[PDB]
Design a protein around this nucleic acid. Structure first.
Ligand SMILES: CO[C@@H]1[C@H](O)[C@H](n2cnc3c(=O)nc(N)[nH]c32)O[C@H]1COP(=O)(O)OP(=O)(O)OP(=O)(O)O
Ligand SMILES: [Mg+2]
Ligand SMILES: [Zn+2]
Ligand SMILES: [Zn+2]
Ligand SMILES: [Zn+2]
Ligand SMILES: [Zn+2]
Ligand SMILES: [Zn+2]
Ligand SMILES: [Zn+2]
Lengths: 87, 479, 98, 67, 45, 576, 49, 115, 8, 257, 44, 93, 82
RNA sequence: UCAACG
């Protein structure tokens, strides 16, 4: 709320740097677990990460107190073992 | 005769058999324009009437049955084999083709309110709701019972008093919109009690429960079907159509005093605009009115087989002349409001009019700050879900043409999906932001000072994030 | 289950394979009016795609005299692609040629 | 389904005349003669009796829901 | 969780999708219903 | 996939960003209402009660909003919510404390929609700019939107089950935008064709022709009643045209009071004889055509579609161009009310008596058809003998079809003309065709004389069976009946073969409608997307978003399309 | 036993075949009902030709 | 669902005035009477009787909207006569006409029976 | 439905 | 500036029909009288129905509608009865309503026709015009209909169930002489029953001085009221409406000044 | 909690969580009986 | 004639006939988001990302997408408050 | 730009009138002082219309020329389109 | 998915 309100005057498009992807993603070490559920509901380092986004419409994601509205979601990264062409 | 062919090998049984089931109910089809016959074939499927004699036993969704069906006064011979006399759909109505108050203009129709009071075109709408008590879940059992606000952690504030002990409302109880027809409870696994699972009436049904049935379905689980009955008196939005392709809503309803009246005292049940007839060229409607006048006076159901050559307008006109009316069917009308004779003589005669399933009550919708979708956080879609009307791309182009930039902005951003995001100034990518903590930080720069708030539609946020997931970076920079 | 599935879904084929399935068969009977019930039972559906706007399969043909109703067709995106049988028309059940 | 009380257009009570109309038809009166004998004069009233379809007999054929 | 009403049960609403304090009518949570939205066979796949 | 989500229609790019579902919108069936003004729309009470427009509490309006708050949601002129300064929203339905109901400056009370609230009215498809127009709201007690009949022409809407969308602006800024840019009176004249979009239509047009005839004379009481419905009446009864023996006003005299201000216009009625202008009685017209309005008074003439319709130079167009938009709105409404109340006295109808013609006319039609069939037979016999000579650039089959079609078309038109001669003054088909409200000379001809040749794909009915149109006809029959000519009129009734052929023609009509909708939609969208950003800058150059100069001045003269009018240069044609 | 085949109503293999109208009424089935439709999962489905 | 109750057409809701008299500024000696919850029945009689009066220059009645229930009656009288006076005198005359008609209809009934 | 030059 | 003095001649008077001619009257007055016949003559008819058991094929609201349309004799009691809104008692009392009760069960094999004769009224004066019978519903064996209903005073402006008349025939200028209706072909049109012209002449010659007068009436009754009583009550009710207007107008005139 | 039976039209009282089968006929199609509370119907 | 001439001028402004199609319209050097709204969508976005294109945000569609006020009419100008005039006049409330 | 060398149209465009009236009305609703004496006008938009007629609206319109420069016309200076 | 509505 303290941040000043601004209107976008220019949108710059570019391919995301892999280093920037690593830094930006809240998930650390990648998504190590195919399963989405650990400890019953939440799987850290899994597809459904509490830090990645708000779940169940009442929880708060770890990174921010979103409450299912404030949080815009946060990205995660998967470190592919061998590189793959982008289609 | 003068020789055309002397080697005929077969002969047609009757030329009217080329027409199908729906086109056979049209009287005098050969006197109509072809597109109008095509339109009547579609409208006849949507008319109201007793669909089947065992309708009381049947529990069907969306069943309409007219109060007082009547068989046509002017009927085709092939209707007998379609059983249209046995199960008619529509009422013969004294129809005047006149311009009375301007409320019958375009395709609308002025209807007699007194006739409507006496049962004219009154129908019943039955809606059936089905619910199944499913025990298939490992620890979930959808038992039928009356939910209690204190006992059930999940509940709703709509009326639950109607439900009996079994959780099913008794037949004969009025149900208004947003009432609980069936009460069901799913037992909740205690991961560490009740998420409400009742079924609620469609808004504005405003009916009385007719039948409630409890059985076991194919799967063996307990099955309950509840049929709700709502009478439907015609209104000023309901759609009425004749057998000649003339469809129109009810413009207004005048009482018997206000309707124009002949010298005998007959007031038209329905007034249709004269402007409908010429462009559409549905002369069959006019001939059916003439034959109906003749038939009602004579006492014999008129014959309207498509190709007869024994029934002509001139013969019908002479027959009507015998019964004391003007030969072309026109009658001297008096104005209901003032009593003065209408200078032009209005064409009045009985005509089979049908009542279509489209009614204004079912088609009226209003939305204001309702529920929003999960994926887009935009208003829902459909009348059932209280959805807002879509502001399409053509609509936004019209608004651009107007130059109403701020109405366009309101309609496409503020009314639908307002949202706020925090964007790093150094890098256009969005940044994590804890409003309660009041600490705003951007990953990838290790920069906290340079973050700006940006207001964008939630759909645009979703688009930018989906672009990021495809490795495209939509870096929105305020500078 | 095969027969019941193909009837209920409206897809003509198997559950696993929908590639060769033809949708539009086995629609729910309309019970608004007895006329609608009867017409729904006596209905023909041309396989030509609705999306294609080429007008040749839609136009009434001279050979439809007495076999198919000329007037009764849906007005909209399916003009002439859905047809209703005439009153006297009778589709042949089939026989052996021996 | 059943003969309407009070013919729609004018309001004359026509619900008491259905059984008499059927009886007069059994007595070999023509429909027009029966309508004349019943007193129905305006074509609006005659429409009611002439075009009525009595479905309630067909409905009564079905056994009652509760005996 | 009405701020002026400690331990107040907020009644659910269907019209706008919010929980509202019944004694003062304050709307706690603006549009917080949204849409609000076989485990038996096998397991997680 | 992500690309699948974004790419298709109803994806994020188009289905959720360019257009989206919106709040404060409502939809229901539309039904006519002649009494409402052009700008008014009739909103049902339930739709009005659900929709709310937030009003800021000011010292001026604190009392009124307090009363609305006290009424609550249940009573119709009530308030659904109270929005405090803090942003807290107090839903009045669930019990609010009496303390909460108190209002202070800065609170925003969300009142129910009331009479006079500006809304935007839309009907899909929104082909042109006039399809979204701002309407004032008048609450009436039934469940259909009710709009005036003249406003139907811009929307291309008739009341046969149609529906329209109602969008309520929620801010004073956007409400003013609608009020001053998109209200219905402001968009009477379209910039597309510099003609008025809205014109008198249906009963009012048909009745205005009859009202304005020389014959119509109104007595004292009827004039009283007609003047009662005239909203801009000065209160002074005009001096009757016929003072003695009995005071009797004329239709034109009363319509002169409807005409706004002082408008000068000369137009011609549809039935204007061509020779009249050259010959004598040019100014004292014998048939009362040549509408002339001087000093806002109808001196002479019979009004019709040309005078009061949607065409350049019409009386409505001259009113908008000269008097202004407000007075023109009053003009439309007053014409409708006064003429529609006269129509109760006069009345209109359509019956079989209109379709039937004199016996002599029927005999003439039959004779025309007989000699036409004989001529077609002679052409066929010439073709069989190979005496026919091919038209240059055409095959013998093509030239045979050309000549046969010419003979049949000439017969068809001649029969139509005989039928049209038969029509009397009282004939109502002629009333509607002459006034221009509905119908055409072609429809009258098909109703009375001859339906005409049925053509499919630009030719006569083709040989669907082997070398014959239907099994009933003999092989290789190129005659009139075999290939589709429908000799009988609709009143007479088509013979069975002609019925099938007529069905074939009508099916072609239906198919063309269905195809044209889709193709035109695509074209319209592409044009808009190509030119969406082009606009007149403050340099008055027309530039796109890139700031490239499309035109140095708009239209090459820097004028807008609605102001311009057709005019004759008058220096060009004359000799030296 | 190799399975179950859905039965079109009022065909030869249906129960209603060859039943007088009074008997159809006794089964709470309409005498005028055309037949020609399957009752699959409780809903009447019609095979469009 | 939005249908008005039937009794609304003839029953005055509380706080509604049957007659409200508002003068007309445009023309001298003219008053515009608004009658609530009344229809063409009353309006036509009153307008006709007003027209019969030699001192009434203008008299007409208008139902502003058929869905709403209201009559607007404009009466303009010559100087030395008041529109309100003309309205009252019209009502008295119509009452006298109806009373005379009732007496004569009763006499006709009694004569037709047993005579 | 009229002629070849008109409408169908 | 005074009211014309009308006259009345009654040509026919039967149990269900009154024909009369009003002369020396304005058209507006005559049309208003005709209008009051239809919409403003009070009659008693059923408006409240509580159905205890309904096993008939017709649903409950169907039965209530049919019951409402059934005419009830209201010859003299309708003047005594007060409108339910006027009565001080809550809901309905004998002064403000009449109670009708119906109990019919079919135990015979033969179909039982529930008729209006089965409606039983607590007040002798109000009876369903029985002294055939209107068929409310037909009942199969084992089907039962039991209901209780109250009947209220009202006029046709509320609902057509309170319409006293069947058809009111109004005609003036039987031979077109004021040319209020302009016949395109005068000869084709049938002559009126009241026409005084010879067969040769189709229309009377135009009379510019003439104005509508000598209005012809034919009032038919549903049996609810005597046909004479319909006309007399309509005249009286219109007189009462005018007198109420006069009272309110006097109040407004005095208050403004 | 009295259910009328389709086949034999005999009312049978059924407690909660009890099988829906009519004694004396065995039919599994039951109808709930008309409520005791009464609804006012306008004849209109 | 204005409306016809404008279409002709837009099609022939660049010097090569610009078809009103995805090809002709998208080839012109407009903003990538504006091209994205018309037909090609995702492919336009991918190409723009690859070449580092920047959206000027002067178009109407681009502003509509981001929820900002369009540069269309009623958005071409920016209103500013006039302090001196606020001081003058009768400030009743 | 300088106050001199103003090249834009002296007349107020329709879009400017719309936005000026709406903005001034929104200000009036938020209890901004009103220059014009109101004759019992409570609706903010109507008061704004009165002010515009009197040319007392305290807003200066900044018109952006396509070259990037801006010209500041006060509402008073511009001729009302009406 | 199908079926209607413009
Ligand atoms: C007059 O034009 C309208 C509009 O163009 C709009 N509309 C309708 N259907 C569609 C559609 O499928 N797709 C699109 N885009 N628009 C559509 O409907 C058209 C007419 O259709 P109709 O010809 O049936 O109108 P009748 O002449 O039939 O009117 P009656 O006498 O029944 O009232
Ligand atoms: Mg339409
Ligand atoms: Zn978060
Ligand atoms: Zn950053
Ligand atoms: Zn009748
Ligand atoms: Zn609280
Ligand atoms: Zn009482
Ligand atoms: Zn049993």
């Amino acid at each position: 709320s303290a941040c000043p309100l601004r209107t976008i005057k220019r949108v710059q498009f570019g391919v995301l740097s892999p280093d920037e992807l690593k830094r930006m993603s809240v998930t650390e070490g990648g998504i190590k677990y195919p399963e989405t559920t650990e400890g019953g509901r939440p799987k850290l380092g899994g597809l459904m990460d509490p830090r990645q986004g708000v779940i169940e419409r009442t929880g708060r994601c770890q990174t921010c107190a979103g409450n299912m509205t404030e949080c815009p979601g946060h990205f995660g990264h998967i470190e592919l073992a061998k590189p793959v062409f982008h289609v | 005769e003068v020789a055309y062919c002397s080697t005929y090998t077969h002969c047609e049984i009757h030329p009217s058999m080329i027409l199908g089931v729906c086109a056979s109910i049209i009287p005098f089809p050969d006197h109509n324009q072809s597109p109008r016959n095509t339109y009547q074939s579609a409208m006849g499927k949507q008319a109201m009437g007793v669909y089947i004699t065992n309708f009381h036993v049947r529990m069907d969704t969306l069943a309409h049955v007219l109060y007082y069906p009547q068989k046509p006064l002017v009927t085709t011979r092939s209707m007998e084999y379609l059983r249209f006399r046995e199960l008619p759909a529509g009422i013969n109505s004294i129809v005047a083709i006149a311009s009375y108050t301007g409320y019958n203009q375009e395709d609308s129709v002025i209807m007699n309110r007194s006739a409507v009071d006496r049962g004219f075109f009154r129908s019943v709408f039955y809606r059936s709701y089905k619910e199944q008590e499913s025990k298939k879940g490992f620890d979930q059992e959808e038992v039928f019972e009356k939910p209690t606000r204190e006992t059930c952690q999940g509940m709703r504030h709509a009326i639950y008093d109607k439900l009996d002990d079994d959780g099913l409302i008794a037949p004969g109880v009025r149900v208004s919109g947003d009432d609980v027809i069936i009460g069901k409870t799913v037992t909740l696994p205690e991961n560490e009690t009740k998420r409400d699972c009742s079924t609620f009436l469609r808004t504005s049904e405003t009916g009385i429960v007719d039948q409630v049935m409890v059985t076991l379905n194919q799967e063996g689980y307990k099955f309950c079907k509840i049929r709700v009955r709502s009478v439907r008196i015609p209104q000023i939005g309901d759609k009425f159509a004749s057998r000649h392709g003339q469809k129109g809503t009810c413009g207004i309803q005048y009482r018997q005093e206000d309707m124009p009246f002949t010298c005998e005292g007959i007031t038209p049940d329905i007034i249709i605009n004269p402007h409908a007839i010429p462009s559409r060229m549905t002369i069959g409607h006019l001939i059916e009115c003439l034959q109906g006048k003749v038939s009602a006076n004579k006492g014999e159901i008129g014959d309207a087989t498509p190709f007869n050559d024994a029934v002509n307008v001139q013969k019908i006109s002479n027959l009507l002349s015998d019964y004391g009316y003007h030969l072309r069917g026109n009658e001297v009308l008096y104005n209901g409001f003032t009593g003065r004779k209408i200078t032009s003589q209005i064409f009045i005669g009985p005509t089979y009019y049908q009542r279509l399933k489209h009614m204004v009550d079912d088609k009226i919708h209003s939305r204001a700050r309702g529920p929003i979708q999960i994926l887009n956080r935009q208003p829902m879609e459909g009348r059932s879900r209280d959805g807002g009307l879509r502001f399409g791309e053509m609509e936004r182009d019209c608004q651009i043409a107007h130059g109403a930039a701020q109405f366009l902005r309101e309609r496409l951003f503020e009314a639908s999906d307002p949202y706020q995001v925090h964007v790093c100034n150094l890098c256009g990518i969005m940044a994590i932001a804890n409003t309660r903590t009041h600490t705003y930080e951007c990953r990838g720069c290790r920069n906290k000072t340079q973050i700006s708030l940006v207001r964008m539609p939630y759909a645009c946020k979703l688009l930018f994030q989906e672009l990021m997931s495809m490795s495209i970076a939509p870096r929105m920079m305020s500078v | 289950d095969g027969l019941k599935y193909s009837l209920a879904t409206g897809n003509w084929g198997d559950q696993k394979k929908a590639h060769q399935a033809r949708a539009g068969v086995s629609q729910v009977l309309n019970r608004l009016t007895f006329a609608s019930t009867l017409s729904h039972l006596r209905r023909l559906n041309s396989p030509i795609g609705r999306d294609g706007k080429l007008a040749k399969p839609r136009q009434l043909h001279n050979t439809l005299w007495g076999m198919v109703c000329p007037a009764e067709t849906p007005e909209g995106h399916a003009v002439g692609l859905v047809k209703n049988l005439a009153l006297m028309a009778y589709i042949s059940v089939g026989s052996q040629p021996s | 389904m059943i003969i309407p009380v009070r013919c729609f257009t004018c309001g004359k009570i026509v619900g008491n005349k259905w059984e008499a109309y059927l009886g007069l038809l059994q007595a070999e009166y023509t429909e027009g003669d029966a309508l004349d004998a019943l007193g129905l004069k305006r074509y609006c009233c005659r429409r009611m009796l002439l075009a009525h379809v009595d479905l309630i007999e067909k409905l009564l054929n079905y056994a009652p829901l509760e005996k | 969780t009405c701020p002026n009403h400690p331990d107040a049960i907020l009644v659910e609403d269907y019209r706008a999708g919010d929980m509202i304090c019944p004694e003062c009518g304050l709307v706690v949570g603006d549009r917080v219903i949204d849409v609000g939205s076989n485990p038996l066979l096998s397991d997680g796949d | 996939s992500l690309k699948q989500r974004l790419k298709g229609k109803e994806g994020r790019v188009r289905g959720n960003l360019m257009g989206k579902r919106v709040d404060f919108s409502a939809r229901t069936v539309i039904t006519p209402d002649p009494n409402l003004s052009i700008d008014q729309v009739g909103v049902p009470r339930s739709i009005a009660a659900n929709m709310t427009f937030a009003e800021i509490v000011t010292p001026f309006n604190i009392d009124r909003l307090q009363e609305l708050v006290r009424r609550g949601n249940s009573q119709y002129p009530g308030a659904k919510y109270i929005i405090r300064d803090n942003g807290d929203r107090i839903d009045l339905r669930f019990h609010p404390k009496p303390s909460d109901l108190h209002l202070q400056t800065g609170y925003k009370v969300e009142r129910h929609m009331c009479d006079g609230d500006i809304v935007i009215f839309n009907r899909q498809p929104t082909l042109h700019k006039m399809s979204m127009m701002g309407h004032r709201v008048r609450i009436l007690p039934w469940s259909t939107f009710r709009l005036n009949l003249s406003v139907t022409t811009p929307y291309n809407a008739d009341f046969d089950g149609d529906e329209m969308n109602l969008h309520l602006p929620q801010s004073l800024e956007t409400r003013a935008e609608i009020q001053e840019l998109a209200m219905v009176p402001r968009m009477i004249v379209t910039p597309q064709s510099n003609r008025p979009v809205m014109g008198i239509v249906q009963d009012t047009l048909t009745a205005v022709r009859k009202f304005t005839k020389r014959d119509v004379f109104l007595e004292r009481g009827e004039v009283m009643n007609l003047l009662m419905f005239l909203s801009t009446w000065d209160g002074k009864v005009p001096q009757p045209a016929i003072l003695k023996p009995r005071p009797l006003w004329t239709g034109k005299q009363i319509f002169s009071l409807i005409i706004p201000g002082h408008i000068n216009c000369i137009r011609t009625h549809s039935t204007h004889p061509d020779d009249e202008d050259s010959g004598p009685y040019k100014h004292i017209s014998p048939g009362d055509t040549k509408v002339v309005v001087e000093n806002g008074e109808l001196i002479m003439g019979i009004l019709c579609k040309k005078s009061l319709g949607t065409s350049a130079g019409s009386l409505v167009h001259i009113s908008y161009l000269e008097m202004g938009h407000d007075i023109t709105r009053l003009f439309y409404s007053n014409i409708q009310t006064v003429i529609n109340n006269w129509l109760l006295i006069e009345g209109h109808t359509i019956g079989i008596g209109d379709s039937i013609a004199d016996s002599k006319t029927y005999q003439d039609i039959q004779n025309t058809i007989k000699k036409a069939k004989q001529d077609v037979i002679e052409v066929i016999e010439k073709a069989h003998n190979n005496e026919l000579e091919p038209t240059p650039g055409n095959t013998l089959r093509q030239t045979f079809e050309n000549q046969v079609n010419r003979i049949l078309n000439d017969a068809r038109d001649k029969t139509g003309s005989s039928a049209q001669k038969s029509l009397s003054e009282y004939n109502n088909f002629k009333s509607m065709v002459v006034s221009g409200a509905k119908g055409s000379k072609i429809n009258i001809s098909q109703v009375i004389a001859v339906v005409g040749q049925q053509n499919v794909e630009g030719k006569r009915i083709p040989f669907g069976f082997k070398h014959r149109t239907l099994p009933h006809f003999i092989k290789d029959d190129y005659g009139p009946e075999s290939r589709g000519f429908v000799e009988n009129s609709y009143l007479a009734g088509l013979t069975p073969t002609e019925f099938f052929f007529h069905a074939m023609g009508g099916r072609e009509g239906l198919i063309d409608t269905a195809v044209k909708t889709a193709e035109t939609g695509y074209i319209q969208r592409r044009l808009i997307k190509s030119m969406e950003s082009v606009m007149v800058k403050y340099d008055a150059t027309v530039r796109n978003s890139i700031n490239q100069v499309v035109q140095l001045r708009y239209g090459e003269d820097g004028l807008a399309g609605e102001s311009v009018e057709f005019q004759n240069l008058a220096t060009l044609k004359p000799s030296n | 036993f190799i399975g179950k085949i859905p039965i079109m109503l009022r065909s030869t293999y249906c129960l209603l075949n060859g039943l007088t109208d009074r008997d159809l009424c006794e089964l709470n089935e309409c005498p005028l009902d055309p037949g020609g439709y399957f009752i699959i999962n409780g809903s009447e489905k019609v095979l469009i030709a | 669902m939005n249908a008005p109750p039937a009794f609304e057409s003839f029953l005055l809701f509380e706080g509604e005035k049957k007659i409200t008299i508002n003068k007309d500024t445009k023309v001298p000696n003219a008053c515009l009477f608004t009658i609530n919850k009344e229809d063409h029945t009353l309006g036509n009689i009153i307008k006709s009787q007003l027209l019969k009066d030699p001192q009434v220059l203008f008299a007409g009645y208008k139902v502003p909207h058929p869905l709403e229930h209201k009559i607007i009656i404009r009466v303009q009288t010559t100087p030395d006569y008041s529109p309100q006076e003309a309205f009252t005198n019209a009502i008295t005359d119509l009452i006298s006409e109806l009373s005379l008609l009732e007496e004569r209809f009763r006499v006709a009934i009694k004569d037709k029976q047993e005579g | 439905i009229w002629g070849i030059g008109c409408n169908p | 500036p005074y009211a014309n003095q009308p006259t009345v001649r009654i040509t026919e008077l039967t149990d269900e029909n009154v024909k009369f001619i009003i002369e020396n009257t304005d058209l507006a007055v005559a049309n208003s009288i005709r209008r009051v016949f239809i919409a403003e003559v009070p009659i008693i008819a059923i408006d409240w129905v509580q159905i205890d058991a309904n096993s008939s094929v017709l649903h409950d609201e169907f039965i209530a509608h049919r019951l409402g349309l059934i005419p009830l004799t209201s010859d003299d009691i309708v003047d005594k009865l007060q409108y339910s809104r006027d009565c001080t008692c809550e809901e309905f009392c004998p002064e403000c309503s009449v109670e009708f009760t119906l109990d019919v069960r079919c135990n015979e094999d033969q179909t039982r026709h529930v008729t209006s004769r089965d409606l039983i009224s607590n007040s002798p004066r109000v009876i369903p015009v029985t002294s055939d019978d209107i068929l409310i519903v037909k009942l199969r064996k084992g089907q039962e209909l039991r209901l209780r209903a109250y009947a209220k005073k009202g006029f046709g402006k509320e609902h057509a169930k309170w319409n006293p008349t069947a058809g009111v025939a109004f005609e003036y200028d039987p031979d077109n002489a004021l040319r209020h209706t302009v016949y395109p072909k005068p000869e084709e049109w049938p002559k009126s029953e009241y026409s005084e012209l010879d067969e040769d002449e189709s229309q009377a010659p135009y009379d510019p001085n003439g104005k509508p007068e000598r209005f012809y009436y034919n009032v038919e009754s549903c049996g609810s009221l005597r046909p004479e009583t319909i006309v007399l009550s309509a005249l009286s009710g219109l007189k009462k409406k005018l007198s109420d207007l006069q009272t309110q107008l006097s109040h407004e005139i005095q208050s403004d000044v | 909690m009295i259910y009328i039976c389709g086949e034999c039209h005999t009312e049978n009282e059924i407690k909660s969580r009890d099988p829906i089968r009519c004694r004396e006929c065995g039919y599994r199609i039951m109808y709930k009986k008309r409520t005791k509370r009464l609804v006012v119907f306008d004849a209109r | 004639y204005r409306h016809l001439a404008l279409l002709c001028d837009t099609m022939t402004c660049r010097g090569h006939l610009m078809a009103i199609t995805r090809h002709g319209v998208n080839r012109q050097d407009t903003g990538p988001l504006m091209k994205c709204s018309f037909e090609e969508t995702v492919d336009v976005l991918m190409e723009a990302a690859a070449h580092g294109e920047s959206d000027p945000m002067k178009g109407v569609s681009e502003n509509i997408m981001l929820g900002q006020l369009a540069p269309a009419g009623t958005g071409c100008f920016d209103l500013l408050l006039d302090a001196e005039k606020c001081k003058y006049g009768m400030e009743i409330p | 730009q300088a106050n001199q060398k103003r090249i834009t149209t002296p007349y107020m465009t329709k879009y400017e009138r719309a936005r000026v009236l709406g903005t001034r009305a929104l200000q009036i609703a938020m209890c901004a002082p009103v220059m014009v004496e109101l004759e019992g006008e409570t609706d903010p938009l109507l008061i704004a219309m009165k002010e515009l007629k009197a040319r007392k609206i305290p807003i200066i319109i900044r018109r952006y020329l396509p070259d990037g420069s801006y010209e500041d016309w006060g509402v008073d200076e511009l001729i009302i389109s009406d």
